[PDB]
């Protein structure tokens, strides 16, 4: 753990696709 | 020369604050990395 | 059940602070991103 | 969410393979 | 050119580094 | 610029090599 570390903090890594839209729709539907 | 020096001042003015921000998030990510290691130390311990 | 609940409390205790840290650096990276956009607005303007 | 964002909008990312053809055939068959 | 095409439109692809800051500083200095 | 943004803040991205050691040595020598 002396080296247990992470490099960065990120967001939005990627590109929009209708498939992602569908996944978000499903998640919303569930919740 | 005078005008060039004025704009030169304005230049580093921004990047000085930016450097402060860089070290700021260095400290914050150190807090979060140490706290991730802290919850990991509790995960290993507890 | 009692002991399990105690350790359960300890569990989320850490991750709550971790969530606070996440939003914390969200705000800090918003400060730095807005300030990068600010120096960029000065770069475009000045 | 202040940073909730996506980088791009894309299509056709990739290379044709007979396997992709088979997948499309299956999807069509279903639908 | 019948296939001359591009896939996406993107921004911000990457991670901030002090080196990028220096490059931006140089560009501003020039301009 | 409405989308002028960056994704992350990172460090140490990579692997040590003697070549990197030499580069650091050169930089130190200079400075």
Numbering used by the authors:
A (entry chain J), D (entry chain G), E (entry chain C), F (entry chain E): 1 to 31
B (entry chain C), C (entry chain I): 593 to 638
Please, what does the article write about this entry?
In our cryo-EM map, FliD forms a pentameric architecture, consistent with the low-resolution cryo-EM structure of FliDse, with a similar overall architecture consisting of two pentamers in a head-to-tail arrangement. In addition, a significant subset of particles adopted top-view orientations, with clear 5-fold symmetry. This allowed us to obtain a structure of the full complex, to 4.7 Å resolution. A pentamer is about 170 Å in height (the decamer is ~300 Å) and 130 Å in width with a 20 Å lumen. We note however that the map shows a wide range of local resolution, with the leg domain well defined and with visible density for the large side-chains, while the head domain is more poorly defined. The FliDcj structure shows that the FliD protomer folds in on itself in a ν-shape, which results in N and C termini next to each other in the leg domain, as illustrated in the topology diagram. The overall architecture, as proposed previously, consists of a D0 domain formed by a long coiled coil, consisting of two helices located at the termini. A four-helix bundle forms the D1 domain. Connected to the D0–D1 leg domains are D2–D3 domains, rich in anti-parallel β-sheets, forming the head. In particular, we note that the D0 and D1 domains in the flagellin are largely structurally similar, and thus synonymous to the D0 and D1 domains in FliD. However, while it was predicted that the D0 domain consists of a two-helix coiled-coil, as present in the flagellin and hook, our structure reveals that the N-terminal 17 residues are extended into a stretch that folds under and behind the monomer, interacting with the preceding subunit via a short β-strand (see below). As a consequence, the C-terminal helix of the coiled-coil is not partnered with the N-terminus, but instead interacts with that of another molecule through hydrophobic interactions, forming the pentamer-to-pentamer interface.
